[PDB]
Short mmCIF file of C-alpha atoms and ligand atoms in Angstrom, two decimals:
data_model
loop_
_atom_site.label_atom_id
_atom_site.label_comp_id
_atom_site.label_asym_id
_atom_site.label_seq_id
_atom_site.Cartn_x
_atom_site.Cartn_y
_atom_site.Cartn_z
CA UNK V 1 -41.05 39.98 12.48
CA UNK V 2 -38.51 40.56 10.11
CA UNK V 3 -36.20 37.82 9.24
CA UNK V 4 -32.44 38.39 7.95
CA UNK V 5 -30.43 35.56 6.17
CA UNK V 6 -26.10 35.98 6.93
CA UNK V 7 -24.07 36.17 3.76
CA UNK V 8 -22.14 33.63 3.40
CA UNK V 9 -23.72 31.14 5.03
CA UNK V 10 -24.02 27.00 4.41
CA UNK V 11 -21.73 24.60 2.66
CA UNK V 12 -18.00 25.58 1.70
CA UNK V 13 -15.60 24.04 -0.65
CA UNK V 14 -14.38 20.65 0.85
CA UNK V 15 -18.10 20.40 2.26
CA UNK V 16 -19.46 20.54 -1.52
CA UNK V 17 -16.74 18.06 -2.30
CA UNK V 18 -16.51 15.17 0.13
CA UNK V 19 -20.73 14.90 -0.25
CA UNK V 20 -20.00 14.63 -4.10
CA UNK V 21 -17.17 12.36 -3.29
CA UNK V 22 -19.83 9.68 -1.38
CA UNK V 23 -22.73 10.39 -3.81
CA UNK V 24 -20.61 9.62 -6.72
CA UNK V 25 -19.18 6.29 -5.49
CA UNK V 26 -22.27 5.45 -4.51
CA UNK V 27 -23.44 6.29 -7.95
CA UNK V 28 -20.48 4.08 -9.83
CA UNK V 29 -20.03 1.26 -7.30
CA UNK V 30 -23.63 1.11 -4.98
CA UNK V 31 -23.91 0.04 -2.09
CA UNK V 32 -22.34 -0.35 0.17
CA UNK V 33 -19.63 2.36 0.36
CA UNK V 34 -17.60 2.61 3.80
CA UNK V 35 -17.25 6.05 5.29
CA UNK V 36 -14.62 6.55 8.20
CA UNK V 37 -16.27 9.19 10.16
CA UNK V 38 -19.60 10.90 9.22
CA UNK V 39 -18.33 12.75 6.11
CA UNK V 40 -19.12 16.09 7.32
CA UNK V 41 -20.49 16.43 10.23
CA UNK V 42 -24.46 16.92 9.77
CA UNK V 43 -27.18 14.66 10.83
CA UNK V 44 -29.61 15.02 7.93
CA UNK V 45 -26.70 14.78 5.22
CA UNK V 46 -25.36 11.34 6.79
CA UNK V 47 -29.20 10.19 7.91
CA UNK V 48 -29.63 10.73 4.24
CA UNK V 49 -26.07 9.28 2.29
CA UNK V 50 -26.99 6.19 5.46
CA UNK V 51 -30.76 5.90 3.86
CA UNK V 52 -28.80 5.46 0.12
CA UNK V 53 -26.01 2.63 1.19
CA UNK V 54 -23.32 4.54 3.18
CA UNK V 55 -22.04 2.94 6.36
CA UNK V 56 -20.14 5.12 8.50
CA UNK V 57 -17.44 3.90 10.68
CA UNK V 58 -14.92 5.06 13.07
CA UNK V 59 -12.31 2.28 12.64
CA UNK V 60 -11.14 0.37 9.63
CA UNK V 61 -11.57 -3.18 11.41
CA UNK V 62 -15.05 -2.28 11.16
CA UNK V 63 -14.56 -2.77 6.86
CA UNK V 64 -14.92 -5.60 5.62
CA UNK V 65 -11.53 -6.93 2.59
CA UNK V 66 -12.78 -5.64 -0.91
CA UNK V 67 -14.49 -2.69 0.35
CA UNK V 68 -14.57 0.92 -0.85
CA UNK V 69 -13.63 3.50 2.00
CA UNK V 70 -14.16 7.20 2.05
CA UNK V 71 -12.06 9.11 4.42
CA UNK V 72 -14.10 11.83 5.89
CA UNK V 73 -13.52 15.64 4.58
CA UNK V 74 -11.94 16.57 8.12
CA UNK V 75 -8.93 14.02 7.48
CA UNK V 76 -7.14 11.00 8.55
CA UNK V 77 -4.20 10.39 11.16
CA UNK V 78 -1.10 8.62 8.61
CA UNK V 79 -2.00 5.41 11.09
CA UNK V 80 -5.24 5.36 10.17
CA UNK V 81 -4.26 5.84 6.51
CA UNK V 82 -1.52 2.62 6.74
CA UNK V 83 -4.03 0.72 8.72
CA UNK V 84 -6.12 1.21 5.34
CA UNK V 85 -3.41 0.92 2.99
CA UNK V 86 -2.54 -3.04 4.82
CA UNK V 87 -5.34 -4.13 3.76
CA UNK V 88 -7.16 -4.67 0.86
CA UNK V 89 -9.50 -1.60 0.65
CA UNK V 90 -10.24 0.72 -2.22
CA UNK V 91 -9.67 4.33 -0.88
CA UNK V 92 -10.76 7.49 -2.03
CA UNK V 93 -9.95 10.16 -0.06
CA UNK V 94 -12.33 13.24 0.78
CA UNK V 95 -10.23 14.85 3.24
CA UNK V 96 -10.39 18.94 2.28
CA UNK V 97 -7.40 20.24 0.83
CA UNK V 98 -7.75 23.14 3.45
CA UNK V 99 -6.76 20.31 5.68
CA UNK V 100 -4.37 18.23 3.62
CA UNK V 101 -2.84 21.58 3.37
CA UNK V 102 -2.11 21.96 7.43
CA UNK V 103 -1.19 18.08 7.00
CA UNK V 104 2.08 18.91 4.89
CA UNK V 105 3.50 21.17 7.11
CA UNK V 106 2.94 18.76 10.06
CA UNK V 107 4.65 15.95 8.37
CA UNK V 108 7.53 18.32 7.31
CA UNK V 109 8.49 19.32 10.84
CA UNK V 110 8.17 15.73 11.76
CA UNK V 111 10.84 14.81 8.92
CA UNK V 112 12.79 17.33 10.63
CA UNK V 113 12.59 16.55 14.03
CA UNK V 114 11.62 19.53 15.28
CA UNK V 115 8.65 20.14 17.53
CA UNK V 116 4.84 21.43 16.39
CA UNK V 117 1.70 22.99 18.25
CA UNK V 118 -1.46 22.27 17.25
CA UNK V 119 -4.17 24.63 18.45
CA UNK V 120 -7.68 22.87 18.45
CA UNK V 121 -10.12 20.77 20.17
CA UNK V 122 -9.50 17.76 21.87
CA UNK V 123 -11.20 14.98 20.89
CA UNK V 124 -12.14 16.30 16.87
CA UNK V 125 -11.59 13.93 14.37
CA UNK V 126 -9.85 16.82 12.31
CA UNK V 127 -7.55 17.48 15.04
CA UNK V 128 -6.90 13.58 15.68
CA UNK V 129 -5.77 13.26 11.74
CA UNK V 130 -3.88 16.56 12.10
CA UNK V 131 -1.21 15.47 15.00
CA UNK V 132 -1.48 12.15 13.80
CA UNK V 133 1.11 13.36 10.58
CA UNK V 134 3.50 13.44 13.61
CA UNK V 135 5.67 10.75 14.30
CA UNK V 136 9.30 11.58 14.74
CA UNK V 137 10.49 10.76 18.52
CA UNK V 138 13.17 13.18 18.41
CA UNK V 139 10.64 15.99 17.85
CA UNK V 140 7.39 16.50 19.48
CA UNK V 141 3.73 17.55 18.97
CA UNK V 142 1.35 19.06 21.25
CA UNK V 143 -1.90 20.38 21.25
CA UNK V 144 -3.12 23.58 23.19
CA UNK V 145 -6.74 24.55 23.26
CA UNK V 146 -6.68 28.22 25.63
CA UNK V 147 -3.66 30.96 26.75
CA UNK V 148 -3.85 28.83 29.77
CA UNK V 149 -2.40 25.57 28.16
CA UNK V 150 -0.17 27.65 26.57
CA UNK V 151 1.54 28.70 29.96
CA UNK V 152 1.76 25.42 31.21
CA UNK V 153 3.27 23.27 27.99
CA UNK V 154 7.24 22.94 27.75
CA UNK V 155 8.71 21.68 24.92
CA UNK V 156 12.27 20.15 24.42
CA UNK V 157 13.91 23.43 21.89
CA UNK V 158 12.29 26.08 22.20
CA UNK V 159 14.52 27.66 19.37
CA UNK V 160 13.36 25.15 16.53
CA UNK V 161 9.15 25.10 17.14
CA UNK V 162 6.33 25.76 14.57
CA UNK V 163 2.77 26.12 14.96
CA UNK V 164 -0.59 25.16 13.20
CA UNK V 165 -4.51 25.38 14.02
CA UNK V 166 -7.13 23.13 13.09
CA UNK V 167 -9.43 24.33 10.34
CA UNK V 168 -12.89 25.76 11.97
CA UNK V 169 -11.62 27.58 15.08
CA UNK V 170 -13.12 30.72 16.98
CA UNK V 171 -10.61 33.61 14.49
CA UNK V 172 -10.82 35.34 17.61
CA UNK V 173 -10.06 32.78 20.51
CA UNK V 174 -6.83 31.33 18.26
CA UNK V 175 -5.94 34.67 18.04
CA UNK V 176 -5.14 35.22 21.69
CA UNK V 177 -3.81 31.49 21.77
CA UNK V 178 -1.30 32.99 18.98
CA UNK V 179 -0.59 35.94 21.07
CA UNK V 180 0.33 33.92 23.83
CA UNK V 181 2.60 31.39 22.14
CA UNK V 182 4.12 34.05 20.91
CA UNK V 183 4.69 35.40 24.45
CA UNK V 184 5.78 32.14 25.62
CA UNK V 185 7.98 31.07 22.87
CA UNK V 186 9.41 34.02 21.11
CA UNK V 187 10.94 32.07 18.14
CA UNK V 188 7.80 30.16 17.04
CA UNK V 189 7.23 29.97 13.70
CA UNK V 190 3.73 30.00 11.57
CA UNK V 191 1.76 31.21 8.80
CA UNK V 192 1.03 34.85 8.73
CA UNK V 193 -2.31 34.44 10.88
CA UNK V 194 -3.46 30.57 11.14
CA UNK V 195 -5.08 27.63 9.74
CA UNK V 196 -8.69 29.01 9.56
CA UNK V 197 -9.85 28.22 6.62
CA UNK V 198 -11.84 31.36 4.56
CA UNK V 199 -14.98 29.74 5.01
CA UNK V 200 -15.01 30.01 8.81
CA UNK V 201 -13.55 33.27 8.45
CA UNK V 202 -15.72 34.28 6.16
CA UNK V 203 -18.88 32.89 8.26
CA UNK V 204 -17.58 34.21 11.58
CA UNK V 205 -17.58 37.91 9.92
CA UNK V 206 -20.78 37.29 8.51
CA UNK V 207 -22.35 36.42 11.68
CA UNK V 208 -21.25 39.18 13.54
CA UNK V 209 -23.15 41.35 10.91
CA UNK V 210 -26.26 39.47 11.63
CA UNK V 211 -25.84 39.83 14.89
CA UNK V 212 -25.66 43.27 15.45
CA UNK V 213 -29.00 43.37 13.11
CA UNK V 214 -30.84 40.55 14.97
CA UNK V 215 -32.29 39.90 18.79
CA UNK V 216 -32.06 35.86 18.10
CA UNK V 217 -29.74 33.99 15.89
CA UNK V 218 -30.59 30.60 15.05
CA UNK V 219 -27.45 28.54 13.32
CA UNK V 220 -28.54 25.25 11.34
CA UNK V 221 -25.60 23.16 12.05
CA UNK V 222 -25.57 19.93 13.73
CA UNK V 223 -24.04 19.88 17.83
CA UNK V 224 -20.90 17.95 16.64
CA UNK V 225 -20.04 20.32 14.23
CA UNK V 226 -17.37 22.46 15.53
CA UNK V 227 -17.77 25.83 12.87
CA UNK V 228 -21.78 25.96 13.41
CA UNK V 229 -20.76 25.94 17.11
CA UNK V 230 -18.71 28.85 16.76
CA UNK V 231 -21.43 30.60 15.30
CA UNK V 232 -23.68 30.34 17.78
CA UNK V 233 -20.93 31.17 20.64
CA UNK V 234 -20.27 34.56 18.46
CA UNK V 235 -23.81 35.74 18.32
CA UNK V 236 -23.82 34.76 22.44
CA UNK V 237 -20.80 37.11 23.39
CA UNK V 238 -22.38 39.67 21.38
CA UNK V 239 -25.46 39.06 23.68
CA UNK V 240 -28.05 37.85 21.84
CA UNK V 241 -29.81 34.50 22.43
CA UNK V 242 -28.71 32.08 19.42
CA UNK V 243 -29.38 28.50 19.40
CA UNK V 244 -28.01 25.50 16.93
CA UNK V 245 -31.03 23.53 15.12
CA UNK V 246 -30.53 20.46 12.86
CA UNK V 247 -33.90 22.01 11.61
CA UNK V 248 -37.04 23.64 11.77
CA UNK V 249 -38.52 21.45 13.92
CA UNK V 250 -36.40 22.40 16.73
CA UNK V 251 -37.46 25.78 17.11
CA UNK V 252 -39.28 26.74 20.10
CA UNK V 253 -42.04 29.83 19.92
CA UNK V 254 -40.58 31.18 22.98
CA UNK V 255 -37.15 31.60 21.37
CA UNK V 256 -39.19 34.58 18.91
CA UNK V 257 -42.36 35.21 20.39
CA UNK V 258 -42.08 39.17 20.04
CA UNK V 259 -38.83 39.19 18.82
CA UNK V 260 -38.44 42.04 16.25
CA UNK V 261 -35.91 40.81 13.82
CA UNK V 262 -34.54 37.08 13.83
CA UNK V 263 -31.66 36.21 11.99
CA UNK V 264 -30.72 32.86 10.43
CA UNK V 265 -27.39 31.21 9.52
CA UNK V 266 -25.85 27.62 8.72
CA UNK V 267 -22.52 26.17 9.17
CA UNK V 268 -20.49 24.75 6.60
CA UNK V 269 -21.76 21.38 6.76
CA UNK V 270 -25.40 22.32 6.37
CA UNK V 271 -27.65 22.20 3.49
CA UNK V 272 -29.44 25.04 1.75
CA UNK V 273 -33.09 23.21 2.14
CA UNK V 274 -32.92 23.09 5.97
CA UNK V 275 -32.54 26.96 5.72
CA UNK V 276 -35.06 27.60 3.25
CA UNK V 277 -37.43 24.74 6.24
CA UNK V 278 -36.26 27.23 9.03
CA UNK V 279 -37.61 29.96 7.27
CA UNK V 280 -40.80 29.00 6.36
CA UNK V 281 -41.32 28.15 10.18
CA UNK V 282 -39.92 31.28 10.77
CA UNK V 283 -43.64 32.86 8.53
CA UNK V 284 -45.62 30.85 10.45
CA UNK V 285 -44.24 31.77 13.54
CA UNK V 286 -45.23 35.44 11.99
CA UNK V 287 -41.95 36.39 10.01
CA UNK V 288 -41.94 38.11 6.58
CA UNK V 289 -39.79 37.41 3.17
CA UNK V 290 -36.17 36.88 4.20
CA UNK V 291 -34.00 38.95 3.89
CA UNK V 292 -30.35 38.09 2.69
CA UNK V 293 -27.55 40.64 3.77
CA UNK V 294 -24.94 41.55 1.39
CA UNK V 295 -21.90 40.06 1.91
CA UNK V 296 -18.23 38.86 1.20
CA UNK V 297 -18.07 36.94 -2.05
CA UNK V 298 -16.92 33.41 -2.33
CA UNK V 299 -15.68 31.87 -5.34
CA UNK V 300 -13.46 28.96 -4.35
CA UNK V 301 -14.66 25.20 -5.67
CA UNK V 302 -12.73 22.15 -4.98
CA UNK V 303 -13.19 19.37 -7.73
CA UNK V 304 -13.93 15.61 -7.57
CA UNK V 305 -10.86 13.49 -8.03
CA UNK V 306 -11.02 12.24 -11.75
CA UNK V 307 -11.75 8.78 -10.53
CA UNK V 308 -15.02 9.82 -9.52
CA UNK V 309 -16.68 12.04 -12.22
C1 LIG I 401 -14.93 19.39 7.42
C2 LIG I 401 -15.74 20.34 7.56
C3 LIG I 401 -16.67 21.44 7.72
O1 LIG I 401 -17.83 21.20 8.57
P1 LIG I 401 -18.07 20.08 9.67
O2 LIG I 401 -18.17 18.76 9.01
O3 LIG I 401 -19.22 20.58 10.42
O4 LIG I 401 -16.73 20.04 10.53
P2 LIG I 401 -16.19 20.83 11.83
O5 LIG I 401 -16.75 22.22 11.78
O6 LIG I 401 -14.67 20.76 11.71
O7 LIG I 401 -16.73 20.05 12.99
S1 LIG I 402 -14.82 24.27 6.77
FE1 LIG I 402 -12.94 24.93 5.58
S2 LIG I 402 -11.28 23.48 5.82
FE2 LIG I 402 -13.31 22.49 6.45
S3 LIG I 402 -14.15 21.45 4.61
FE3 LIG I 402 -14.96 23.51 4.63
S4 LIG I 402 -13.49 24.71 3.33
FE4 LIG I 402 -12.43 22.85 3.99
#
């Protein structure tokens, strides 16, 4: 059975980042160090920063005065942030700047009064953070998730109305969300394409490779993690079976018995050493060396705040 590795696969920027961010507080202050939210969202990197002296939380009345608080990488509403701020916590903030980025604009058409669309999931802590940067009455913000939200949402001035996406979207799906706000509301304005960052992008495209290479595609990502998610859906509408593992013990011989080529990929929140476990049960299971396909270079890194060297 051959066995082909996507290209680029595995932790991005703010991913690299907001783990350094915990480890390193951990390292300067021990334990314990509050985390609002699992910092990214994978099971054996919080089981693990949990194991060290991490507690993570989803509400700051869960911290106790004097603490140190991490905010997750996928961001913070500006309530949750004041809520913080009141009292007497030390904050560091590990929110990616791929997000903090979407954050600005959100906040600037708030100071302006003049209504926003989010498009994203309901319910994700990034897009929870993201509309909560809006706050002016006199405006609005809304999220849509499909085309069919889209053609149901009216807004108050159409004339003066912006857009944004959350960060780990389907580049596909937001597209035809973009094509019908666009429809809908011809004087929206946005960026040139959306809020995607370039390492969904970037793992979206290199999934589709794989995927046109391989019968099964496994994804290492955990179920709450939106971009692994969208990996696996890809690989599905392109018809293969594809399944998202937290690790190699999930794997299930019927997924490869006789199964010519298998193809492996992680999401951004997922460490290299559950790949390199998925593999080797991949030899058992009777697959050879892996394989890694060429791909699109990335050369982005996001420092540690000084603070935390
Ligand atoms: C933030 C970030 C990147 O990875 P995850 O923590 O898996 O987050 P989502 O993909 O937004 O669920
Ligand atoms: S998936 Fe993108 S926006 Fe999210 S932490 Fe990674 S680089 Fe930042």
């Amino acid at each position: 059975m051959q066995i082909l590795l996507a290209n680029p696969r595995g932790f991005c920027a703010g991913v690299d980042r907001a783990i350094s961010i915990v480890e390193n507080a951990l390292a300067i202050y021990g334990a314990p160090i509050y985390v609002r939210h699992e910092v990214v969202h994978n099971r054996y990197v919080v089981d693990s920063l949990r194991e060290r002296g991490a507690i993570f939380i989803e509400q700051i009345s869960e911290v106790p005065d004097g603490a140190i608080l991490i905010f997750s990488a996928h961001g913070v509403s500006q309530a949750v942030r004041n809520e913080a701020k009141s009292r007497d916590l030390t904050v560091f903030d590990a929110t990616c700047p791929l997000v903090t980025k979407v954050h600005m604009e959100v906040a600037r058409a708030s100071r302006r009064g003049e209504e926003s669309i989010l498009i994203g999931h309901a319910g994700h802590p990034e897009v929870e953070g993201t509309m909560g940067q809006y706050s002016n009455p006199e405006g609005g913000m809304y999220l849509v998730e499909s085309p069919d939200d889209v053609w149901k949402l009216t807004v108050k001035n159409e004339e003066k109305l912006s857009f944004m996406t959350q960060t780990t979207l389907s580049v596909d799906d937001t597209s035809d969300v973009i094509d019908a706000l666009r429809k809908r509301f011809p004087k929206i304005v946005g960026p040139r394409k959306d809020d995607i960052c370039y390492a969904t992008t970037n793992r979206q495209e290199a999934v589709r490779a794989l995927a046109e290479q391989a019968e099964v595609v496994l994804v290492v990502g955990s179920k709450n993690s939106s971009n692994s998610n969208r990996l696996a859906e890809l690989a599905q509408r392109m018809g293969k079976r594809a399944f998202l593992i937290d690790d190699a013990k999930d794997i299930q011989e019927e997924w490869v018995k006789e199964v010519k080529c298998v193809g492996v990929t992680a999401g951004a929140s997922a460490p290299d050493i559950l790949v390199q476990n998925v593999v080797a049960r991949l030899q058992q299971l009777g697959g050879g060396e892996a394989i890694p396909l060429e791909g699109r270079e990335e050369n982005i890194v996001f420092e540690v705040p000084k603070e935390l060297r």
